[PDB]
Amino acid sequence: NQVWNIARKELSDGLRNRWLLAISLLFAVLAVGIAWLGAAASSIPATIASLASLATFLMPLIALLLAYDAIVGEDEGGTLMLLLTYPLGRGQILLGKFVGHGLILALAVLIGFGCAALAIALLVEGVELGMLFWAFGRFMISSTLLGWVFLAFAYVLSGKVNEKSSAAGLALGVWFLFVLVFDLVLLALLVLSEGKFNPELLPWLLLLNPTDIYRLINLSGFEGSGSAMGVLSLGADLPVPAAVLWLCLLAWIGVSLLLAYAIFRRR
């Protein structure tokens, strides 16, 4: 298939990016360090909310470092106009780049949360291996989905621009807006209104931010204290169950990938 033949390139091109392997080893040496501090203090709801905050800062960062120059990095490099004269479509050199960069994020977090689990089962004596495999299995198949959102965000902001220097400004703008501005805009809207703006609409604004849907999935069972949540204490007021929160994370992929394909179809 042609979707795999161009996925095999990006799997062998993203792994030679030295800027990726710096901040993917930084994801590995911090997830061991958080899980070691979570082992010496024993607690359990504090080492889950800190790992989910660690992957909030880094799994959008590895996704936007990969794919900000996926379309516009090939357009000004000349090899995009060449690729359309090969037996391909615009839907195959985008979904193929999504499969190729998606297996890197599926491997950058299997390295990261894989050694984080081995720094718990070999550190915390008498831990429940069934509870460890289930909690860190929920971390693996949902930090990819957060990574695949910002991967699909980067194809939107690469097809729209026509210069790679302006794509790096938008990819830094999307990383700043969704991670640590929307968490601060929602905080400043709650502080300055003292919680009396809207008592029913404000928990639904967490679904307009995929880093907040990511944090609400992993903090489902291990709630614990309220200050470990912070802004995410609004998530107890959400009447939706846990299964739709998986589906709103997949809908953030599929809407922002069909938008990524409709932009690229009129490139």
């Binding site: 033949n5 000349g78 090899t79 690729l83 359309l84 004269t85 090969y86 037996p87």
Partner: protein, 298 residues
Amino acid sequence: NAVEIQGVSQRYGSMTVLHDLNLNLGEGEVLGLFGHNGAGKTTSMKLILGLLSPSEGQVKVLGRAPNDPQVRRQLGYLPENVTFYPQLSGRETLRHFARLKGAALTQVDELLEQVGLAHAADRRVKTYSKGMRQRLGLAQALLGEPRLLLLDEPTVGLDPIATQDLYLLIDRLRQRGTSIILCSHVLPGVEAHINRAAILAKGCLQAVGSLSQLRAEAGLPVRIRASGISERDSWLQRWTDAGHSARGLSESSIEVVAVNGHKLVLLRQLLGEGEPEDIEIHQPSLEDLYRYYMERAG
């Protein structure tokens, strides 16, 4: 009959940037598109590749549709400037393009030696020169026996030993039966290797045909210059007897502007009486023919 463009008048933005070009290309000829880097030449280049839709007209590449996958395995496109993938190697870039075009993987090791790039194989493309990337750009164009090359300035940033060897590689493929289109701007030198030129200007295809036809359909003076002649005082007048102005620009740079209507009587005068030193029948080159047809259009 590889490329049969007929009646195409491409419109975009209601501007009509191409109009009514009837460009039939034979099955062994080497055509040359010689417009500017504006919407006349590069629009007709995108029509043959199939990545543009011909409004009001039909483009038939190899007897079929231009965007079919069965004919797009038989094309080869060398673009203008391709800094390909700076972190990939040389073999892995060409094996990537071999998997996409359906070519056999045994062609990659015999194309990195056919093009002079076996010393720089398994080395990263960021460590390549501009000429070495044009060598790599040619290597994916000859991938899996293409029946239609389409080279858009293949000899920029390239040494003249490799440039002369590239046109011999072009002349190997012309005898094999593969039509080549040379969209170029390095017009001195390309006139020895093309079969038919196609000068298009302001959208309208002005002139097409071989180099013998473009000199026949356009009266141009042959420019004989004899630098370093033995005798000069009689050579101002003995050629001017049939209307050829002995115009000079230096101490001895007499560029006699002739009329191309009296070629019998000046050579029987020269070789019947008097010994010459260096006769120079200088045909009207591709710069002078292009400067006539572009001037005729405006």
